Enzyme design. Structure first.
Site, mmCIF file in Angstrom:
data_model
loop_
_atom_site.group_PDB
_atom_site.id
_atom_site.type_symbol
_atom_site.label_atom_id
_atom_site.label_comp_id
_atom_site.label_asym_id
_atom_site.label_seq_id
_atom_site.Cartn_x
_atom_site.Cartn_y
_atom_site.Cartn_z
ATOM 1 C CG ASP C 348 -2.006 -1.043 1.149
ATOM 2 O OD1 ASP C 348 -1.695 -2.211 1.454
ATOM 3 O OD2 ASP C 348 -3.160 -0.709 0.798
ATOM 4 C CE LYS C 459 -15.874 4.718 -3.879
ATOM 5 N NZ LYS C 459 -15.556 3.449 -3.160
#
Ligand SMILES: *[C@@H]1O[C@H](CO)[C@@H](O[C@@H]2O[C@H](CO)[C@@H](O[C@@H]3O[C@H](CO[C@H]4O[C@H](CO[C@H]5O[C@H](CO)[C@@H](O)[C@H](O)[C@@H]5O)[C@@H](O)[C@H](O)[C@@H]4O)[C@@H](O)[C@H](O[C@H]4O[C@H](CO)[C@@H](O)[C@H](O)[C@@H]4O)[C@@H]3O)[C@H](O)[C@H]2NC(C)=O)[C@H](O)[C@H]1NC(C)=O
Ligand SMILES: *[C@@H]1O[C@H](CO)[C@@H](O[C@@H]2O[C@H](CO)[C@@H](O[C@@H]3O[C@H](CO[C@H]4O[C@H](CO)[C@@H](O)[C@H](O)[C@@H]4O)[C@@H](O)[C@H](O[C@H]4O[C@H](CO)[C@@H](O)[C@H](O)[C@@H]4O)[C@@H]3O)[C@H](O)[C@H]2NC(C)=O)[C@H](O)[C@H]1NC(C)=O
Ligand SMILES: CCCCCCCCCCCCCCCCCC(=O)OC[C@H](COP(=O)([O-])OCC[N+](C)(C)C)OC(=O)CCCCCCCCCCCCCCCCC
Ligand SMILES: CCCCCCCCCCCCCCCCCC(=O)OC[C@H](COP(=O)([O-])OCC[N+](C)(C)C)OC(=O)CCCCCCCCCCCCCCCCC
Ligand SMILES: CCCCCCCCCCCCCCCCCC(=O)OC[C@H](COP(=O)([O-])OCC[N+](C)(C)C)OC(=O)CCCCCCCCCCCCCCCCC
Ligand SMILES: CC(C)CCC[C@@H](C)[C@H]1CC[C@H]2[C@@H]3CC=C4C[C@@H](O)CC[C@]4(C)[C@H]3CC[C@]12C
Ligand SMILES: CC(C)CCC[C@@H](C)[C@H]1CC[C@H]2[C@@H]3CC=C4C[C@@H](O)CC[C@]4(C)[C@H]3CC[C@]12C
Ligand SMILES: CC(C)CCC[C@@H](C)[C@H]1CC[C@H]2[C@@H]3CC=C4C[C@@H](O)CC[C@]4(C)[C@H]3CC[C@]12C
Ligand SMILES: [Mn+2]
Ligand code: NA
Ligand code: NA
Ligand code: NA
Ligand code: NA
Lengths: 36, 291, 995
Positions: C348, C459
């Protein structure tokens, strides 16, 4: 006066002194507090 | 079956033909150079020892007392009545004594006549090729009293009186030194020739000593031992046909059908003993005339 | 399974029916402050630690018996027993016997004792290290005591303690939910279904398992937060007894055991075959009936590496320790080897590649880019703090925010204090608090009516606040999120106070601003608000958050805020090592593609010269859809494109791209990427910290859970735990994993060399009929002296210089013991070691009187005990013991020579690629082994009584130096072979000798 006689004691003690020296040095290395 | 042979890349047991050839060539050149280095180091070592003198001899000092006939378990057992049960000892005795035959010591360029009585050490010189081949002190087969293979081929076993010829271990540059009579207070009664290395056989325990009988010593000049005029030894390179001193012991009047252990011992300054080597200077033979 | 639902649903009796008052008087706990640490320790000592009793441990004195009397130890005990039995026979037969068999039995027994004692030392060390890791970073539980919330070891939780769990935490023990805000638990391990079941304090069902106010032990909290009271601790919990009596693990065939057990079986087979063949050979050669069995025992013991288990144990435990010291905690020992085989690392961006320490850097409003955040000189920003648009921007940046400063922090600086919230929200807080005013005061004025937090479905974050101004409409809506989504949801843009329709030129400037701020490697967030009309929304209006009572479109964009997040320090060098080690690095981030590409190019994921299809298109001004996809070696795959992507398209992208960056990828899509990478025949390590990563962490070959920010779900689903959350630590762990292979291979290649010199003397003894150069006692001496400590010392060897400059290995090609290792140990090194011993044997015999040529056939009479007329080359006559002394001295010298060549073998085994001059003799244990083996040989050769006990006699000085040429030969040979391999990679020398 004995030509058929080798001083085995001399070589024996020489080798034993070496064995003790090597053993002590090996312990010094494995147990070393400053050799690292 | 795939591992045994696959034809796709011509692999046998695991690898192709070129692979087998390459490893075979590598192992051939490698093992060849390895064996060559081994042989080279062996030759460099050989260039340190000499042809007529070994670099170490304390492992053969003192010498050993050997007996003929040589016996497995050192037991000389036979049936005097049966001429077959003692043929082995006879064969061994004849084979060893043939090197001492009256005809073997013909030529004088090798065999030299030495005194009929024991003399001092006949020092032939040094261990080199400067003085070429060396002389050999002859040893008459007759010096053995009743066991010479001259009158009785059997040497005694035919009528229950065997003979065990004793011999000293050959040592290069060895000079036997008999004990001085000043120190003579330990070994039993024996003839005293300052030029004779004495040998005396006895029993071992309070039973064998009693059942032994009567010892009969035979040797050069009638002395129970080895004459000093035959030493030192100069090796197999300088004295190819050197004959070593011999001596016989006949055990007349031995207890029939009984095994008796006897120990013969060679005394002297240069002769030592050992509790582990049953043959260093002495030896042991257990005989049984089971008729 | 005959262990679950009907048998477990009946072992239940709970207190979920009790009220808060009844619960308080039952457990005696201050439901708002928790119990005092005094009572905590009292209950801990009375009831015991919150842990499950483990199975019994084998006694500390049973391993001694299991080792001293084990497999091969039994063989040596049998040999010593036979020797003692024959000594009794000799003590009963002829008087005045010898004690050779008594000493032989004592020798064999001492061999068993020493071997078992050494193996026991090594295995006890393995235990000492195995325990050191199970408690390195123990699982924590967040309890509340004396009002303060503190995290303690899970074993220190007591009954009555009130625990607070959040999303991703494991349930420390059975709890009674007292307070909760949208808490969902995963009872998968309990009932079977993984569907998140909600947890509320309200009592809903009579069955304790079906109720909603009881969290069960071993379960995990997926989403939300809840406080509960411990009702059962340790073994008394519902799932506790069930899980420990039915959670037995497997016997997993690790590649280490897969290779070691096999190779040990084949070597034991060939050794036992040699033993029996030499046994019948000796019996035919008139060997004594007992010395033949003793020779068989010695051959079997010597030709078998009876320390390979200890070597493997030491290697794996030492490298596990090394990994733990370099912030790589391995959960199981399989990961210890899977790490060395890593070929792809899916990491990540934020949390693993960066420090996740964000700081607001640039703003975009009034169509202008504004730098900001003065260097604590009470200047604020680089623009006027009174701008209307900036006022509206900071207003929604502090109102729509949800992070707050913790207690007692408004008395120190702002960039050195503590916060409570997301990293992005913390940066947005520290910015306006350092340059505008007090965010708590602003958020108190604009009272928040309803709010939509950050959800994976929405979101975006949003909040409706009451407006206290005068030209104010009653309700003000403010939201933030992805700049693209925020821009698509707005009809007007606020320009210098006056809003105007969102035209195409403004959108083009917005896109250019996004490219500008993202090109620097900054995370950008969109911000917007709306003045809700009063006619449609009166004062007492109740905005529904579940049915969208208020509009979400036709908003007014305010501005863009961008934060800086510097990458970790050692990340660039780590990706450099990976590129130099043939390990493909893939970035899997949910960030924007522009920022992800910038960060990747900065840290080195995307190297210079390489371009994506977009870069080519922009360079030659052609449509992106026109460029040839194969012309780009690197690429930035969007998440929305992965969703509409097929397995074949994924395989295409992964196969034909060397630098892949997945942007806007959700944590669930991680498993798709992991599967795709594994489908390409690659070992994948994947970094996870959230609860949604669990499938990707378990499916990957090596799951790396973040040790600091990682939730307990990720830590429990991962194979390794990253202690410093640093990507470079993954690469360091990979290097450590690669080190075990080299160390084990070197140790194995060293242990097998001595078999050739241990068996060749008997073979030549039969073939050449010469006195035996090496006896049984001396063979045991060789094994105990040069094969135990020196072989273990290789496990402590350090990494070579090209450990990370090579390519990874795969299980079906790179085996521990291959044909080349046997050829080198048995055909090249072993042969030279044996030749050295044969040479010194010939030297001793020739110097004593028996030239090497004379030794042919002489053995028939040499071994004869009654032939005392043996004639040497010089014509001298030797007795039996007189010549046996020389033979046994040759045996002793053979052993010494073997030690001498073992020096060189041990030194050349230190490196299999590099030269010993680059590596150096930094291994202290190896030097110790050399010194000790030489000292042991000297002692066994010169100590008085050795001649009469071990048949070993003193060695003359010029006999020690006879093996030096062969030792130096081995050294120079391996040095030149490795030099040829180094200067000719992939050549014949390597393809045939590189073990
Ligand atoms: C091993 O070597 C030794 C020497 O180291 C040999 O020594 C023999 O020992 C015996 C026992 O002491 C002696 O005594 C007697 O020998 C008698 C036979 O000899 C008699 O005649 C001799 C003359 O004639 C012999 O010699 C000539 C050559 O000179 C030959 O041509 C002829 O054929 C004869 O051989 C005389 O010189 C001698 O003195 C005798 O008068 C035996 O008959 C005699 O037995 C008596 O004693 C026994 C107890 O010992 C007893 O049991 C009998 O009943 C009987 O009373 C006794 O043995 C030998 O003289 C002596 N020399 C020789 C040459 O024998 C020994 O012989 C030799 N071992 C063998 C197996 O031969
Ligand atoms: C020299 O060697 C012999 C051993 O052979 C020792 O003396 C004896 O020799 C004979 C002959 O071999 C041995 O054998 C026979 O013993 C029989 C036993 O009877 C007598 O002896 C026992 C004690 O054992 C008395 O108690 C008993 O009363 C008897 O008097 C005899 O019957 C045998 O006689 C036969 O042989 C002789 C000659 O051989 C013939 O002339 C006779 O006609 C008859 O056929 C015979 O004597 C005997 O055992 C030996 N005695 C022992 C061993 O003690 C000598 O001791 C040894 N020399 C030295 C110095 O020790
Ligand atoms: C007359 C007496 C002769 C006595 C000969 C005594 C030989 C004693 C050697 C004993 C040790 C054997 C150890 C095998 C260990 C295998 C370990 C293992 O699993 O390895 C995997 C490896 C395989 O690794 P791999 O599977 O990773 O690689 C495979 C590679 N391909 C696919 C190309 C095949 O095992 C082997 O390589 C096995 C090698 C066996 C070799 C057997 C050689 C026998 C030769 C005897 C020579 C006799 C000469 C006599 C000369 C007389 C002159 C007068
Ligand atoms: C037939 C004749 C044969 C002659 C053989 C010997 C020929 C050469 C002369 C001496 C060589 C042997 C001694 C070498 C000593 C090397 C020391 C060293 O650290 O070298 C560093 C060097 C490395 O140096 P470095 O690591 O400082 O430098 C590296 C620099 N970079 C990083 C830039 C590359 O490594 C070696 O040379 C290794 C030598 C190992 C030798 C091991 C021998 C066996 C060891 C112990 C056996 C028992 C001894 C008992 C002694 C008892 C005494 C009472
Ligand atoms: C008339 C001449 C008589 C000469 C008599 C004998 C004199 C002594 C002979 C050798 C002793 C000294 C050896 C030094 C070796 C190199 C040391 C070194 O650090 O180089 C670093 C270099 C390595 O440097 P590097 O660049 O790899 O390491 C980099 C380090 N950093 C990263 C910090 C920059 O070494 C090598 O590459 C070694 C190649 C070795 C090839 C050896 C082939 C022969 C095998 C053994 C040699 C001889 C042993 C003795 C034989 C004696 C016979 C009697
Ligand atoms: C670093 C490496 C190459 C050198 C190894 C050290 C060598 C020189 C050491 C190892 C064992 C040592 C031997 C040990 C015992 C003896 C007995 C003594 O009475 C004479 C010296 C002698 C024979 C030693 C000579 C030196 C020796 C051979
Ligand atoms: C100890 C004595 C009796 C036997 C020694 C014989 C030598 C020649 C043996 C020992 C080990 C053997 C090697 C073992 C393994 C391999 C792999 C194979 O695919 C090619 C042959 C090769 C390379 C062998 C060649 C023969 C070899 C080198
Ligand atoms: C691999 C080879 C070519 C190295 C060249 C040097 C050789 C010839 C040297 C190196 C060490 C030397 C050995 C060192 C010690 C002894 C003991 C001595 O009592 C006999 C010679 C002997 C056995 C030497 C023979 C010559 C020797 C083998
Ligand atoms: Mn995450
Ligand atoms: Na072994
Ligand atoms: Na996994
Ligand atoms: Na070895
Ligand atoms: Na071995």
């Amino acid at each position: 006066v004995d030509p058929f006689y080798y001083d085995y004691e001399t070589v024996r003690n020489g080798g034993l002194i070496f064995a003790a020296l090597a053993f002590i040095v090996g312990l010094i290395i494995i147990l070393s507090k400053r050799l690292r | 079956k795939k591992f045994i042979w696959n034809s796709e890349k011509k692999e046998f047991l695991g690898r192709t033909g070129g692979s087998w050839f390459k490893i075979l060539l590598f192992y051939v050149i490698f093992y060849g150079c390895l064996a060559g280095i081994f042989i080279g180091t062996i030759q460099v070592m050989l260039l340190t020892i000499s042809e007529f003198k070994p670099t170490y001899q304390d492992r053969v000092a003192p010498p050993g007392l050997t007996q003929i006939p040589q016996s497995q378990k050192t037991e000389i057992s036979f049936r005097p009545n049966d001429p077959q049960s003692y043929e082995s000892y006879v064969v061994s005795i004849v084979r060893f004594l043939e090197k001492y035959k009256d005809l073997a010591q013909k030529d004088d360029m090798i065999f030299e006549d030495c005194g009929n009585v024991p003399s001092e050490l006949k020092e032939r010189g040094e261990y080199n090729n400067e003085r070429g081949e060396r002389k050999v002190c002859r040893f008459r087969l007759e010096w053995l009293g009743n066991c010479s293979g001259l009158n009785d081929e059997t040497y005694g076993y035919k009528d229950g009186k065997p003979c065990v010829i004793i011999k000293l271990n050959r040592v290069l540059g060895f000079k036997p030194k008999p004990p001085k009579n000043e120190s003579l207070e330990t070994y039993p009664v024996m003839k005293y020739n300052p030029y004779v290395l004495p040998v005396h056989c006895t029993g071992k325990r309070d039973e064998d000593k009693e059942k032994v009988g009567t010892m009969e010593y035979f040797g050069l000049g009638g002395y129970p031992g080895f004459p000093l005029q035959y030493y030192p030894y100069y090796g197999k390179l300088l004295q190819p046909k050197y004959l070593q001193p011999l001596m016989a012991v006949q055990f007349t009047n031995l207890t029939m059908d009984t095994e008796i252990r006897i120990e013969c011992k060679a005394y002297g300054e240069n002769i030592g003993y050992s509790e582990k080597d049953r043959f260093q200077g002495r030896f042991d033979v257990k005989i049984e005339v089971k008729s | 399974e005959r262990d679950m639902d009907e048998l477990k649903k009946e072992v239940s009796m709970d207190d979920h029916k009790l009220s808060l008052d009844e619960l308080h008087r039952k457990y005696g706990t201050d439901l708002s402050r928790g119990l005092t640490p005094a009572r905590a320790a009292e209950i801990l000592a009375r009831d015991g630690p919150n842990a499950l009793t483990p199975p019994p441990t084998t006694p500390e004195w049973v391993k001694f018996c299991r080792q001293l009397f084990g497999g091969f130890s039994m063989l040596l005990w049998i040999g010593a027993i036979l020797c003692f039995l024959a000594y009794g026979i000799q003590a009963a037969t002829e008087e005045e016997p010898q004690n050779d068999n008594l000493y032989l039995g004592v020798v064999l027994s001492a061999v068993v004792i020493i071997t078992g004692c050494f193996s026991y030392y090594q295995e006890a060390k393995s235990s000492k290290i195995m325990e050191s890791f199970k408690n390195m970073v123990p699982q924590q539980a967040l309890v509340i005591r004396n009002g303060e919330k503190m995290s303690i070891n899970a074993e220190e939780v007591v009954v009555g303690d009130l625990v607070e769990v959040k999303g991703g935490d494991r349930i420390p023990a059975d709890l009674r939910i007292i307070s909760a805000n949208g808490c969902k638990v995963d009872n998968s391990s309990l009932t079977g279904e993984s569907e998140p079941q909600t947890r509320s304090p309200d009592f809903t069902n009579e069955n304790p398992l079906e109720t909603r106010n009881i969290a069960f032990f071993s379960t995990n909290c997926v989403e939300g937060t809840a406080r509960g009271i411990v009702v059962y601790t340790g073994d008394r919990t519902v799932m506790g007894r069930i899980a420990t009596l039915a959670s037995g693990l497997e016997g997993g065939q690790t590649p280490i055991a897969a290779e070691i057990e096999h190779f040990i079986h084949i070597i034991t087979g060939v050794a036992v075959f040699l033993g029996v063949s030499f046994f019948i050979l000796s019996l035919i050669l008139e060997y004594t009936w007992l010395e033949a069995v003793i020779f068989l025992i010695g051959i079997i013991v010597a030709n078998v590496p009876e320390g390979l288990l200890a070597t493997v144990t030491v290697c794996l435990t030492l490298t596990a320790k090394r990994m733990a010291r370099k912030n790589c905690l391995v959960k199981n020992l399989e990961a210890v080897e899977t790490l060395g085989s890593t070929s792809t690392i899916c990491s990540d961006k934020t949390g693993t590649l960066t420090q996740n320490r964000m700081t607001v850097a640039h703003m975009w409003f009034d169509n202008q880019i504004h730098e900001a955040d003065t260097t604590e000189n009470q200047s604020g920003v680089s623009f006027d703090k009174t701008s209307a648009t900036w006022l509206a921007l900071s207003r929604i940046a502090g109102l729509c925010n949800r992070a707050v400063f913790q207690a007692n922090q408004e008395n120190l600086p702002i960039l050195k204090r503590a916060v409570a919230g997301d990293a992005s929200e913390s940066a947005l807080l520290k910015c306006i608090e350092l340059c505008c005013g007090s965010v708590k005061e602003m958020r108190e004025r604009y009272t928040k009516i309803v709010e939509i937090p950050f959800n994976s479905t929405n979101k975006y974050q949003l909040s409706i606040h009451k407006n206290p101004n005068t030209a104010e409409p009653r309700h003000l809506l403010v939201m933030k999120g992805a700049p693209e989504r925020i821009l698509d949801r707005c009809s007007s843009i606020l320009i210098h106070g006056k809003e105007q329709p969102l035209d195409e030129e403004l959108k083009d400037a917005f896109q250019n601003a996004y490219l500008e701020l993202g090109g620097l490697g900054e995370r950008v967030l969109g911000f917007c608000h709306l003045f809700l009309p009063d006619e449609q929304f009166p004062e007492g209006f109740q905005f529904d958050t579940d049915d969208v009572n208020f509009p979400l479109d036709n908003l007014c964009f305010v501005g863009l805020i961008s934060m800086i997040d510097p990458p970790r320090a050692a990340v660039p060098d780590a990706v450099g090592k990976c590129r130099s080690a043939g390990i493909k690095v893939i970035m899997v981030t949910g960030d924007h593609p522009i920022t992800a590409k910038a960060i990747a190019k900065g840290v080195g994921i995307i190297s210079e010269g390489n371009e994506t299809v977009e870069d080519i298109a922009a360079r030659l001004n052609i449509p992106v859809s026109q460029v040839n996809p194969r012309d780009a070696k690197a690429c930035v795959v969007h998440g929305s494109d992965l969703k509409d992507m097929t397995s074949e398209q994924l395989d295409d992208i992964l196969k034909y791209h060397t630098e892949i960056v997945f942007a806007r990828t959700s944590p669930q899509q991680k498993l798709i990427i992991v599967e795709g990478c594994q489908r390409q025949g690659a070992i994948v390590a994947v970094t996870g910290d959230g609860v949604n990563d669990s499938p990707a962490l378990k499916k990957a070959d090596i799951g790396v859970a973040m040790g600091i920010a990682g939730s307990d779900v990720s830590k429990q689903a991962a194979d390794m735990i990253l202690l410093d959350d640093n990507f470079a630590s993954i690469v360091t762990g990979v290097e450590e994993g690669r080190l075990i292979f080299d160390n084990l291979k070197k140790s194995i290649a060293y242990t097998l060399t001595s078999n050739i010199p241990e068996i060749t003397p008997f073979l030549i003894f039969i073939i050449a009929n010469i006195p035996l150069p090496l006896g049984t006692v001396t063979i045991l001496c060789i094994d105990l002296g040069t094969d135990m400590v020196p072989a273990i010392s290789l496990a402590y060897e350090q990494a070579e210089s090209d450990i990370m400059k090579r390519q990874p290995r795969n299980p079906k090609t790179d085996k521990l013991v291959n044909e080349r290792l046997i050829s080198m140990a048995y055909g090249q090194i072993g042969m030279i070691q044996a030749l050295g011993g044969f040479f010194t044997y010939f030297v001793i015999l020739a110097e004593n009187g028996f030239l090497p040529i004379h030794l042919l056939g002489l053995r028939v009479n040499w071994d004869d005990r009654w032939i005392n007329d043996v004639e040497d080359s010089y014509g001298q006559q030797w007795t039996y013991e007189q010549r046996k002394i020389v033979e046994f001295t040759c045996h002793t010298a053979f052993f010494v020579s073997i030690v001498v060549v073992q020096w060189a073998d041990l030194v050349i085994c230190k490196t299999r690629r590099n030269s010993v001059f680059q590596q150096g003799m930094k291994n202290k244990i190896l030097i110790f082994g050399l010194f000790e083996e030489t000292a042991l040989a000297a002692f066994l050769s010169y100590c008085p009584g050795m001649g009469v006990a071990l048949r070993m006699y003193p060695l003359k000085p010029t006999w020690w130096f006879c093996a030096f040429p062969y030792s130096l030969l081995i050294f120079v040979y391996d040095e030149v072979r490795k030099l040829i391999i180094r200067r000719r990679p992939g050549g014949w020398v390597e393809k045939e000798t590189y073990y």
